[PDB]
Amino acid sequence: LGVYLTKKEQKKLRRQTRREAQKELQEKVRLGLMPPPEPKVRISNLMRVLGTEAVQDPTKVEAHVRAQMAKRQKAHEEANAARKL
Amino acid sequence: SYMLPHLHNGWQVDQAILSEEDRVVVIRFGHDWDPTCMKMDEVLYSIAEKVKNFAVIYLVDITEVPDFNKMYELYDPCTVMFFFRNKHIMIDLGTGNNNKINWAMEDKQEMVDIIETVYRGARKGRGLVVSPKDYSTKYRY
Amino acid sequence: EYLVSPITGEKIPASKMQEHMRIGLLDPRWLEQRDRSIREKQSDDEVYAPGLDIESSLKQLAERRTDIFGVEETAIGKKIG
Amino acid sequence: ALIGLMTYFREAVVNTQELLDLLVKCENKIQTRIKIGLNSKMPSRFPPV
Amino acid sequence: SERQAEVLAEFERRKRARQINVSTDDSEVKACLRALGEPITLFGEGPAERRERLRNILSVV
Amino acid sequence: DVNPKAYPLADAHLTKKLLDLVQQSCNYKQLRKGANEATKTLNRGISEFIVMAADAEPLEIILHLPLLCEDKNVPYVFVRSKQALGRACGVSRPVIACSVTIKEGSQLKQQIQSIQQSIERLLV
Amino acid sequence: RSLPVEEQPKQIIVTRKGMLDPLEVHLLDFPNIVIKGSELQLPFQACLKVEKFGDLILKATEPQMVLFNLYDDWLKTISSYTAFSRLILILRALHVNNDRAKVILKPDKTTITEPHHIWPTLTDEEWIKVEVQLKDLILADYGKKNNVNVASLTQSEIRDIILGMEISAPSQQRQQIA
Amino acid sequence: WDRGIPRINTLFQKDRHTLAYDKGWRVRTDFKQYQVLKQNPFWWTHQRHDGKLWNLNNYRTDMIQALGGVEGILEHTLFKGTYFPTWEGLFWEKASGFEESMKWKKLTNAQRSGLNQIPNRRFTLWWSPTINRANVYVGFQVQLDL
Amino acid sequence: LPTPIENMILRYVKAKADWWTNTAHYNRERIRRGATVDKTVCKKNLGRL
Amino acid sequence: VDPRQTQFGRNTLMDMRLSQQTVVDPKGYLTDLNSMIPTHGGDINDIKKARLLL
Amino acid sequence: PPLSYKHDTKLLILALERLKEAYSVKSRLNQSQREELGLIEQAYDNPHEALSRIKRHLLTQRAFKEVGIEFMDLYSHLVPVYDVEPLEKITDAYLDQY
Amino acid sequence: FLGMPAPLGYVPGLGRGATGFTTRSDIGPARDA
Amino acid sequence: LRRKAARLVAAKCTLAARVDSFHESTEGKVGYELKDEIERKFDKWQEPPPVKQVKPLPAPLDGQRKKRGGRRYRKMKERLGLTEIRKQANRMSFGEIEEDAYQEDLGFSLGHLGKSGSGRVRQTQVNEATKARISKTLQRTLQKQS
RNA sequence: AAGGUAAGUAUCGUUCCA
RNA sequence: AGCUUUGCGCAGUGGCAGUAUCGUAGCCAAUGAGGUCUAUCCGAGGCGCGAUUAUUGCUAAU
RNA sequence: UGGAACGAUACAGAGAAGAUUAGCAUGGCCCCUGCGCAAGGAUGACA
Known part of the structure; x- marks a missing residue:
């Protein structure tokens, strides 16, 4: 029968998996199979990131950041739906 | 003194100046038996490992190598010369002579200070660097 | 005796499962620091002289400083007197 | 340092001539230190201003 | 203007090999190597890089 | 098997349930690992049952635990490998003895009572 | 003094620099209120x-x-x-x-x-x-006033124009530092 | 005002209440030498409990009067070169923004040694018309190359 | 360590320690008497003391 | 100084504004009390300018 | 020092002010200095818990961490300078004031 | 490199194009050239 | 090492005691094994420290290096930024004698901070980002001690 | 007598010397 | 049928700290790591070394 | 013709100290939420 590895190696293995995924993603992006990650922006970061470009057309910029928020939330919700039993 | 690498003939010191590009060559010309030269050939011992990244120290006995006495004025008992990429780096002290440190000092921090200042001014591409401390006196009082 | 590996799900000997868990989770980035500093010291060049050079320099220094070495005292820079 | 003792030793300083000489000597030492800090060669004169 | 690039093949073989089971036992390591024919070790090839070489070799077959 | 001096030695059927209970008590902070801590719990009277391993070569280092359980009327049972018990307890090092203590309104009361019942009918 | 304490302003910006001075006296009882002047020719x-x-x-x-x-x-x-x-x-x-x-x-x-x-x-x-x-419209008015094509105005100076930044070069002969 | 060994101005001090509960302060001030590295010249007293026992406003007044006043001192300086219309409405920047930022950065001691003497250069410049003089520093002169 | 090497190293340590003590006390005498000494000399002498 | 203590031991303002389909929301003009001597004081820097203002 | 003392905070205030006088004139701070100032300012922020800690230290603490030593040279004699653990300095100062 | 005999035809100094200095007239020998 | 040795020797003592209670290994094989383990731990504790390399000082830095920036860099700039009270203290007026504050150490003048020469009419409010803070491990020590 | 050399890149002249 | 407990995963939102995170084919460790209160009690990791912009990446200017 | 030594003008001259500063995401802790896995509790139900 199997054995139950302890919480220390639980955290260690989780860290290995996440670092593995991050490095693989970064190597793929350096290759260019996906575009470089666009900076995740919120309402609080709206004028920090895009403010200079957000002065000219503020409503377009807030629409774009809210679209990014909606895309993230939709990715989460449909990820749960795909993982739904 | 005896621990640091030694150069025996004229060709070796010129090669040691030429065989390096990314550090500073600090040559202690003099006689390792001199009370003056032995005073600072232990300071150069105590910091040889510390300055390995940007400095290499060779020792030369002018009697063993009587080829640079006339050209570089090797007549003070002890002399220190800094070379960078086959270029003698002049250094401005408080003393009148601005080509050498012709006296043996005592503090292991000030010599690393001078060597690092020489390296910093030599990466830029200068020929004369300026020491932090002033040696127009001895700060004794 | 057979156990099941918690990480790979494969039959393993019960005697090894301890060091199996010690080593199967060996952190991958550890390998470079094991294989990086050793290369640095392999390519590193010495700072002090070889021991024979210290011996020879000590002999040469003893040749001059008769106020310490030898039995026939002479001047500081003189070979013998 | 000067007012550390001078406000402490007030009237005694007048009667201690050697203390006055030491005070003047030390002030001259401070001035000499500053002048050497300016340039290596000490000046012939140097204004109090 | 042609592709002339198999570097994506290098990334895909790396990511497949990273998900390839390798025994944590040097004995098994060397048993599998003798099964395929690879040497026990190279000059100055310790155990961690022995396992890594085993992984890199069974990435193909 | 390996050690004849194994009275309550359990087989590979309820060992899985025992290790599951050990892990759950670990998640609930409801065990004391180690022979010394098991003995302290037995002395304090708050130990409900202790599980040891038949792989400790000088078994008499832990053969006082069944006697202490007999004194305190506490269920006790063995396993077949110290490494499995140690890893199940929540630590990497091989453990040869662990204890399960009490908790008010514990969610593990039913399972711990079932384990006590199962062991108590296995002595003979 | 009228608004409740949680609604009291923690920062007062002022369009015209002359107003920086009087507020600090009438805000003498509110040391925690920062009064900041504006270089921005802000359209109010x-x-x-x-x-x-x-x-x-x-x-x-x-x-x-x-x-x-x-x-x-x-x-x-x-x-x-x-x-x-x-x-x-x-x-x-x-x-x-x-x-x-x-x-x-x-x-x-x-x-x-x-x-x-x-x-x-x-x-x-x-x-x-x-x-x-x-x-x-704003860029067109600025271009008409300053005789510069709007396209050449990059986003930074577009933001400067909108907020109230515009500079001149009356001291053009003081270029001797070059 | 400013008279009496426990100076009368101490009575109006802000923390007068809490200094009422400060007893044996002079003894601990004396023993401060064993706890702090640098010796205190004013170990014998404490400015809070009996006030400073000296005044220098008259001393500075007389020093300015004897040195020739603002114009009698500024003639020695480089003030007239700066060409300020009057000496009022000025402040001294005791720390340049660049060097005060460098003060906290990770600096090797070589840079820090040559950085603490930046205030010694603006001092030399501010008194250059006096220090760089023919009467003082007797000897030959050399002009700058450019 | 061999006992002859250890004996020689003990003798070295004893001799250098005797010189160290004497030099530290002599430098302290120089400083208290008012002689002219260096800053690094004062630092090293304070460490030795 | 406290007479029991021995050697060994602000900007008032009359106006006041009341808060609360019509955009126009006029507010009443309220007059306030008087200000006595406050314990808080001396929160002023650069007196030679503030005195000139007043 | 009782649990309910009328002058309890006044002595703590004086002790904290005295401990901060050593840093009152300062431009740059080391790590230990930063931690010390943090300790005094935290004890100022929560006087009750700090004083409870002080009472516990006075009542049941008898093992202390090593206190560093150095010397300041007057060129005539050497004055020893002792560095004490930053948390215990507060307790010692409050005890001294009381 | 270290531990090698000097070349027979090598100029002992200045072969690297070095330039000597004369800090003062007294120090050194006569130029004699 | 005695306490650390006392724990180990008592542990092996009870390991031998449990053996002797039931009268096994009467010839002392387990006792000799435990003594061997104790001696091995003892001479492992007394073993001299190994060879530790003296790393050289880092080389002087080059011209420029790219750096990251975000919330962490913003907080670093806030902690090390010139607070208005700090920047107001650096300014030191001009031609305005002031009474020497802090008797115990003169040369400590606050400059325009609290000065009638120039500055804001309101007092320069104190900042909160520069408040002294304790370390995480030290606060952990505080939690455990209480 | 000092502690007071900015370090460089150019063509041109001269001279010894190989 | 829901309710609900706990651990482990995947993501999401938000807060907080950068004098700290991380490695351990180095060693020891519940057969006891480590002990200042309280010790016939406590009782889990510790040490040494290495990486470091006091975790690490891109994008972005100069 | 080699190089050295050497005398001229011509040129530059800041001989200034600086791994510079912005954004996001990872990583650390904590809280909340969704979803899954391993289980496990209390409980609803007349005919």
Whole structure:
């Protein structure tokens, strides 16, 4: 029968998996199979990131950041739906 | 003194100046038996490992190598010369002579200070660097 | 005796499962620091002289400083007197 | 340092001539230190201003 | 203007090999190597890089 | 098997349930690992049952635990490998003895009572 | 002193530098209130040129203070950080000129505007279009005034123009540092 | 005002209440030498409990009077070169923004040694018309190359 | 360590320690008497003391 | 100084504004009390300018 | 020092002010200095818990961490300078004031 | 490199194009050239 | 090492005691094994420290290096930024004698901070980002001690 | 007598010297 | 049928700290790591070394 | 013709100290939420 590895190696293995995924993603992006990650922006970061470009057309910029928020939330919700039993 | 690498003939010191590009060559010309030269050939011992990244120290006995006495004025008992990429780096002290440190000092921090200042001014591409401390006196009082 | 590996799900000997868990989770980035500093010291060049050079320099220094070495005292820079 | 003792030793300083000489000597030492800090060669004169 | 690039093949073989089971036992390591024919070790090839070489070799077959 | 001096030695059927209970008590902070801590719990009277391993070569280092359980009327049972018990307890090092203590309104009361019942009918 | 403590302003910006001085005396009892001057020629003197705004003050027999709300219902569907930007763009455009600004502000013939709110009632995409039109108007006015093609003005100086930054070179002969 | 060994101005001091509960302060001030590295010249007293027992406003007044006043001192300085219309409405920037930022950065001791003497250069410049003089520093002169 | 090497190293340590003590006390005498000494000399002498 | 203590031991303002389909929201003019001597004081820097202002 | 003392905070205030006088004139701070100032300012922020800690230290603490030593040279004699653990300095100062 | 005999035809100094200095007239020998 | 040795020797003592209670290994094989383990731990504790390399000082830095920036860099700039009270203290006026504050150490003048020469009419409010803060491990020690 | 050399890149002249 | 507990995963939102995170084919460790209160009690990791912009990446200017 | 030594003008001259500063995401802790896995509790139900 199997054995139950302890919480220390639980955290260690989780860290290995996440670092593995991050490095693989970064190597793929350096290759260019996906575009470089666009900076995740919120309402609080709206004028920090895009403010200079957000002065000219503020409503377009807030629409774009809210679209990014909606895309993230939709990715989460449909990820749960795909993982739904 | 005896621990640091030694150069025996004229060709070796010129090669040691030429065989390096990314550090500073600090040559202690003099006689390792001199009370003056032995005073600072232990300071150069105590910091040889510390300055390995940007400095290499060779020792030369002018009697063993009587080829640079006339050209570089090797007549003070002890002399220190800094070379960078086959270029003698002049250094401005408080003393009148601005080509050498012709006296043996005592503090292991000030010599690393001078060597690092020489390296910093030599990466830029200068020929004369300026020491932090002033040696127009001895700060004794 | 057979156990099941918690990480790979494969039959393993019960005697090894301890060091199996010690080593199967060996952190991958550890390998470079094991294989990086050793290369640095392999390519590193010495700072002090070889021991024979210290011996020879000590002999040469003893040749001059008769106020310490030898039995026939002479001047500081003189070979013998 | 000067007012550390001078406000402490007030009237005694007048009667201690050697203390006055030491005070003047030390002030001259401070001035000499500053002048050497300016340039290596000490000046012939140097204004109090 | 042609592709002339198999570097994506290098990334895909790396990511497949990273998900390839390798025994944590040097004995098994060397048993599998003798099964395929690879040497026990190279000059100055310790155990961690022995396992890594085993992984890199069974990435193909 | 390996050690004849194994009275309550359990087989590979309820060992899985025992290790599951050990892990759950670990998640609930409801065990004391180690022979010394098991003995302290037995002395304090708050130990409900202790599980040891038949792989400790000088078994008499832990053969006082069944006697202490007999004194305190506490269920006790063995396993077949110290490494499995140690890893199940929540630590990497091989453990040869662990204890399960009490908790008010514990969610593990039913399972711990079932384990006590199962062991108590296995002595003979 | 009127507003409750949680509604007391923690930062007062001032358009005209002369006002920096009096506030610090009338804010002498509020040391935690930071009074910051503005180099930004920020368009609020034109806020009084709106029809629903001026009309109240052009005819009033006695002095009193009244409250408004320059965000009609935008905060129902947009963040305040872009509500302020929309307001400032609209006010810069209105400062540029009133009539063409009104014509832009009424793209639809209906252009419903009840006395409950102030600005015309448009939804998000018409706000996109009107903001683009107002930006084009402001850059066009700046180009006409300073005789520079609008395209050459990159986004940084576009933001400078909108907020109230513009520089000149009267000391052009003081270039001897080069 | 400013008279009496426990100076009368101490009575109006802000923390007068809490200094009422400060007893044996002079003894601990004396023993401060064993806890702090640098010796205190004013170990014998404490400015809070009996006030400073000396005044230098008259001393500075007389020093300015004897040195020739603002114009009698500024003639020695480089003030007239700066060409300020008057000496009022000025402040001294005791720390340049660049060097005060460098003060906290990770600096090797070589840079820090040559950085603490930046205030010694603006001092030399501010008194250059006096230090760089023919009467003082007797000897030959050399002009700058450019 | 061999006992002859250890004996020689003990003798070295004893001799250097005797010189160290004597030099530290002599430098302290120089400093207290008012002689002219260096800053690093004072630092090293304070460490030795 | 406290007479029991021995050697060994602000900007008032009359105006006041009341908070609360019509955009126009006029507010009443309220007059306030007087200000006595406050314990808080001396929160002023650069007196030679503030005195000139007043 | 009782649990309910009228002058309890006054002595703590004086002790904290005295401990901060050593840093009152300062431009740059080391790590230990930063931690010390943090300790005094935290004890100022929460006087009750700090004083409870002080009472517990006075009542049941008898094992202390090593206190560093150095010497300041007057060129006539050497004055020893002792560095004490930053948390215990507060307790010692409050005890001294009381 | 270290531990090698000097070349027979090598100029002992200045072969690297070095330039000597004369800090003062007294120090050194006569130029004699 | 005695305490650390006392724990180990008592542990092996009870390991031998449990053996002797039931009268096994009467010839002392387990006792000799435990003594061997104790001696191995003892001479492992007394083993001299190994060879530790003296790393050289880092080389002087080059011209420029790219750096990251975000919330962490913003907080670093806030902690090390010139607080208005700090920047107001650096300014030191001009031609305005002031009474020497802090008797115990003069040369400590606050400059325009609290000065009638120039500055804001309101007092320069104290900042909160520069408040002294304790370390995480030290606060952990505080939690455990209480 | 000092502690007071900015370090360089150029063509041109001269001279010894290989 | 829901309710609900706990651990482990995947993501999401938000807060907080950058004098700290991380490695351990180095060693020891519940057969006891480590002990200042309280010790016939406590009782889990510790040490040494290495990486470091006091975790690490891109994008972005200069 | 080699190089050295050497005398001229011509040129530059800041001989200034600086791994510079912005955004996001990872990583650390904590809280909340969704979803899954391993289980496990209390409980609803007349005919």
